[PDB]
Amino acid sequence: GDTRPRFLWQLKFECHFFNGTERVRLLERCIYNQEESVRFDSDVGEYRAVTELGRPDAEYWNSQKDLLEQRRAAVDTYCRHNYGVGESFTVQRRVEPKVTVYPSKTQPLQHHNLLVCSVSGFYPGSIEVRWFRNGQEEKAGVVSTGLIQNGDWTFQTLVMLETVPRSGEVYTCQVEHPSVTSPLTVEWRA
Amino acid sequence: EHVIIQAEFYLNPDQSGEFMFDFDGDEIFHVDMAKKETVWRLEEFGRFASFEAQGALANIAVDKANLEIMTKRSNYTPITNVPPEVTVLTNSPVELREPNVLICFIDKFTPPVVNVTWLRNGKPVTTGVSETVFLPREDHLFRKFHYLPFLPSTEDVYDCRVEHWGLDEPLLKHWEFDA
């Protein structure tokens, strides 16, 4: 087999946007194997060693006035620039979630019906899924599987609700997402 | 509220090199180091924006030179293998004979080299499968997705077989129609 040791090098330029291009932070970072060694935070304005292994570079690069000046303007020429370039298909991308409600295939405890609210194929990831019993929100018994990023610019999530079903009751799954002006609702008639 | 990351890496001695852009965890594109061209994650992206693939090849060359410098500086300290967390799911609730897609999520691992294969009833599947490149993580490990388009049935069973230096044995995540 292949047993030779591996040596890895990573370089990451992170552009952080707060309220559009209002506040922008650039973070350039170097990682040797699994360790960040040196970085450039636009908030600091210069390279800073993260570990001794990076000290030589932080010192060396900071001695290059040209680089420092160029890096300092990257927040505009790089970050804000690229943000505006892809804004239309990233920041504004929207795909409505598919919503469906059905009882769980498990159903452990007898006189209890575990309801499942499946919310899938949506974008962006920001979303609010709530459960209501007869128009009044439910806090307890609610358990989510978490937000799942499918890797294809799509998300999905399952939100359960254990209940003590009584004929006539109306359990509603409400979903709020940027893809819709008004919340989506799917009812389960007990 | 939003993060755009230009992520790149070089791995010795595999000679692996990568260059990609990330938007809130999702890949915008990466550069094919051999064909020297921009590969967009979604087709429509390439109709709204462009990227000079040639530029990534310049960065990669510097990335490797720096790897060599750093390797020597650490007195050839090798990377510690971290085995992946593997999970299998469908992209939507499964229903008999209703078109779906099996997703094999390979996460939290390093170095970025894995062997992934799909198994339909113990046999390898090659038809319709697709995969993504290595995606960055805040902790500096990687993620990766493998896909298998299928038609649910009570008869078929699947497995995502993953091999990585951090795994003493190949890991198999089973999946079968339960709902």
């Binding site: 990257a74 620039h81 | 960065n59």
Partner: peptide, 13 residues
């Protein structure tokens, strides 16, 4: 519209 990338600087030899 074209994406701009950041150039990598060489390390201290």
């Amino acid at each position: 519209a074209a994406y701009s990338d950041q150039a990598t600087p060489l390390l201290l030899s």
